[PDB]
Amino acid sequence: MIQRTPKIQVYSRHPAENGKSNFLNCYVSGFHPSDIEVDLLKNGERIEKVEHSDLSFSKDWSFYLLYYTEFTPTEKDEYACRVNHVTLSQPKIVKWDRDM
Amino acid sequence: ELAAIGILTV
Amino acid sequence: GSHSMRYFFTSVSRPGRGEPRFIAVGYVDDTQFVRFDSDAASQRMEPRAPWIEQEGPEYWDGETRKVKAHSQTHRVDLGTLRGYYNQSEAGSHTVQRMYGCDVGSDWRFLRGYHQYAYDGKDYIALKEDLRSWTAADMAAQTTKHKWEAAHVAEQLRAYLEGTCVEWLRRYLENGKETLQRTDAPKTHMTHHAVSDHEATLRCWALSFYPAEITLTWQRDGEDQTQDTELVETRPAGDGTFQKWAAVVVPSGQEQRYTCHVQHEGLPKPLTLRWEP
Amino acid sequence: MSQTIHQWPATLVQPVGSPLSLECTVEGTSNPNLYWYRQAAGRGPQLLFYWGPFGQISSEVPQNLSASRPQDRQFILSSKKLLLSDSGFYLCAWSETGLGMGGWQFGEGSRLTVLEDLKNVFPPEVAVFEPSEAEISHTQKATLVCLATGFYPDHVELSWWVNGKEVHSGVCTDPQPLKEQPALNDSRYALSSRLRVSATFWQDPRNHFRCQVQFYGLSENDEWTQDRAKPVTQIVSAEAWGRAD
Amino acid sequence: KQEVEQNSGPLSVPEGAIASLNCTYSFLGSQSFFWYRQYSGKSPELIMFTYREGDKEDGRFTAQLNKASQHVSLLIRDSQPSDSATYLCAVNDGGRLTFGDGTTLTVKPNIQNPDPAVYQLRDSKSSDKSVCLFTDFDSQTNVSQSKDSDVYITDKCVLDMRSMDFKSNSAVAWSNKSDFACANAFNNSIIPEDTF
Known part of the structure; x- marks a missing residue:
């Protein structure tokens, strides 16, 4: 048995610019087992209609998934990614930094 | 094209 | 390839x-x-x-x-x-x-x-x-x-x-x-001092395919670098990928440092200047 | 101790509308892939069902047929109401778990004949014909001939028994039967076989010769209207003792 | 079908010769191939399988695979009458086998001392039939069907009495007509000897 805690990155498909639509992405990787909860948050409110890639894994057998959904970024709105897994003692929230 | 040979149970 | x-x-x-x-x-x-x-x-x-x-x-x-x-x-x-x-x-x-x-x-x-x-x-x-x-x-x-x-x-x-x-x-x-x-990467340079001066810098790369890239930082030196932060290649969703590599440098305005980007298809190893 | 596959019943003759139940068993492996094929005359086996160890993988959907697997090593093919079209040679096969080279062997098959009218069914009359003294003198050999005539459907099993023992050496049985009434759609059939022994072996009056023909027919309870005993599955034979000159 | 094609035959080959059975498949993704032998009235029996280019020999059988031309062959060496059967070619197109319709093979036995003869057999108590046996003829002799008569004549059959180290061909003819002479029976093509 090996359990591996996920790495979490949150970023956008195309360069962030207020007013024009694109996709918000939360990429979880390096985790095991595969069961995992990933939510995209809109000002703390969970965004519905979230889609994700088909489960796969890398050389070390650790899994990776890409959750995403289209959205329209603005000045008075903050987005984040909430992740929970057996390796975490508490769900982890990673904010969406405009330049990351 | 999936393998159609060499796939056995452990 | x-x-x-x-x-x-x-x-x-x-x-x-x-x-x-x-x-x-x-x-x-x-x-x-x-x-x-x-x-x-x-x-x-x-x-x-x-x-x-x-x-x-x-x-x-x-x-x-x-x-x-x-x-x-x-x-x-x-x-x-x-x-x-x-x-x-x-x-x-x-x-x-x-x-x-x-x-x-x-x-x-x-x-x-x-x-x-x-x-x-x-x-x-x-x-x-x-x-x-x-x-x-x-x-x-x-x-x-x-x-x-x-x-x-x-x-x-x-x-x-x-x-x-x-x-x-x-x-x-x-x-x-x-x-x-082969999609060539759209590179950039972002360095913010926000609160404390000490400037930083990472080599951006957007909308590139395939996912293999060997970007690294150095100034007029040989292939050896020491840092504690960089990001692994990640999917964009459109089928492309995006990555960056960070390194810390002295305070002031943007100094003189070269970025060695290696990607297939790409005409030649790109190195963005942007000294302003 | 090794790997085996059996199937039953071996042969069935059954009316249109009747239920069907064929069984297939395997021994010496576990969690195997199981397959049901149907073979028509002049053709290769055709796939009806392909079940993996935990359920059905194949997408074909035959008519009137269903398969089930009540146990790991037990496979069943059924029909609640047979159609004339369901006549055929049903074959079961297995392969080892996964996608490999192990297995791929068939059981002995189950021949099914579906009939519209049962009154067409007749068992074979059997008769043995003893060697000619001429052949005996022109060569030190004697050829007995068995003749199974007037049977329908046409899938009988003929054998010779010399002194209560089934023999094979010197036996020649026709591959397919011949139609006695060539132009008739429901013509009855005939089949012949020869048993050739030595003159010295035939002459001995102590030697017993017998021709046996297993016939598959109707079940005790099938509907019947004719003024003749119901032609059920039975063995019809004819005997003969040696003859010194 | 069309996914896997083989000539139907009957393919005739002399005893002692090599039988070459061929097969073409149209399913590009086929990764393994099989040959079955099927005797009349019996279920198919596995002969060999192969999953790689070239030849694979197992006793007298040799399967040859050429994926570029999508061709599979089976060569039987030193053919014997007991090899007479229908040979089925199958392709694995996933997790199952898909079969061709087979090629029927007939191996004619070599009759060392042909001595054609027509004999009339004696019957037991019940005798409505007269039975005529045409036997010991060369394996090159064909027995034609019964003329527009209500007599019956079987196709030729091959027997090997392993004991006397001897092989023999036979054909049986019969009828219930009273005018059915045994000498006249088998009117077709030979030069045998009639008893009496």
Whole structure:
């Protein structure tokens, strides 16, 4: 048995610019087992209609998934990614930094 | 094209 | 440039619910082209790229039969492995499998792979020469012995060296508009001092394909760098990828530092200046 | 201790509308792939069902047929109401778990004949014909001939028994039967076989010769209207003792 | 079908010769191939399988695979009459086998001392029939069907009495007509000797 805690990155498909639509992405990787909860948050409110890639894994057998959904970024709105897994003692929230 | 040979149970 | 074809299988037992969740995915390079999910309504191998939809219903019927066969063999494995590891029926366990082909610029066979993992660790793998088995422990030796008695490695040798490369070549050909292309990365330079001066800097790269990039930082020096932060390549969703590498430098305005970006297709190793 | 596959019943003759139940058993492996094929005359076996160890993988959907697997090593093919079209040679096969080279062997098959009218069924009349003294003198050999005539449907099993023991050496049985009434759609059939022994072996009056023909026919309870005993599954034979000159 | 094609035959080959059975498949993804032998009235019996290019020999049988031309062959060496059967070619197109319709093979036995003869057999108590046996003829002699008569004549059959180290061909003819002479029976093509 090996359990591996996920790495979490949150970023956008195309360069962030207020007013024009694109996709918000939360990429979880390096985790095991595969069961995992990933939510995209809109000002703390969970965004519905979230889609994700088909489960796969890398050389070390650790899994990776890409959750995403289209959205329209603005000045008075903050987005984040909430992740929970057996390796975490508490769900982890990673904010969406405009330049990351 | 999936393998159609060499796939056995452990 | 080189190319590859690989298949990934994951089966997770869920005792107290029923059958295991089984997900299979196929890749040609960094592009997913097929998938199968035991919970989907379809119960068919599904295309995930336009150039694979060119294959007729005979091909899909076959891939679907084969992928379900894989699934059921893994379900038998889960029961056998608990026994081997003397574990109980209550715990959830995972079996993973991967295999594929690599070919060079000449599209000729370079190397094959066939490996298996249990609960996230190596269980058994086919050695580089495709003739010997690397068995993790005692349990895997048992498997090793039966796979040798049945000549599993000869069969995989036939698949990996012939069938897999022949089909890799066919797929590259059918989808030359997509698979046999190369998207140049759109680079940038971002350095913010926000509150405290000490300037930083990372080499951006957006909308590039494939995913292999070897960007590194240095100023008029040899290939040696020491930092504690950088980001791994990540998917964009449109089918492209994006990555960056950070390094800390002295305060003030943007100094004089060169960024060595290595990517295929790209005309020549790009190095953005931006001194203003 | 090794791997085996058996199937039953071996042969069935049954009316249109009747239920069907064929069974297939395997021994010496576990969690195997199981397959049901149907073979028509002049053709290769055609797949009806392909079940993996935990359920059905094949997508074909025959008519009137269903398969089930109540136990790991037990496979069943059924029909609630047979159609004339369901006549055929039903074959079961297995292969080892996964996708490999192990197995791929068939059982002995189950021949099924579905009939519209049962009054067409007749068992064979059997008769043995003893060697000619001429052959005996022109060569030190004697050829007995068995003749199974007037049977329908046409899938009988003929054998010779010399002194209560089934023999094979010197036996020649026709591969297919001949139609006695060539132009008739429901013509009855005939089949012949020869048993050739030495003159010295025939002459001995202590030697017993017998021709046996297993016939598959109707079941005790099938509907019947004719003024003749119901032609059920039975063995019809004819004997003969040696003869010194 | 069309997915796997074989000539139907009957393919005739002399005893002692090599029989070459061929097969073409149209399913590009086929990764393994099989040959079955099927005797009349019996289920198919596995002969061999192969999953790689070239030849694979197992006793007198040799399967040859050429994926580029999608061709599979089976060569039987030192053919014998007991090899007479229908040979089925199958392709694995997934997790199952798909079969061709087979090629029927007939191996004619070598008759060392042909001594054609027509004999009338004696029957037991019940005798409505007269039975005529044409036997010991060369394996090159064809027995034609019964003329527009209500007599019956079987196709030729081959027997090997392993004991006397001897092989023999036979044909049986019969009828219930009273005018059915045994000498007249088998009117077709030979130069045998009639008893009496």
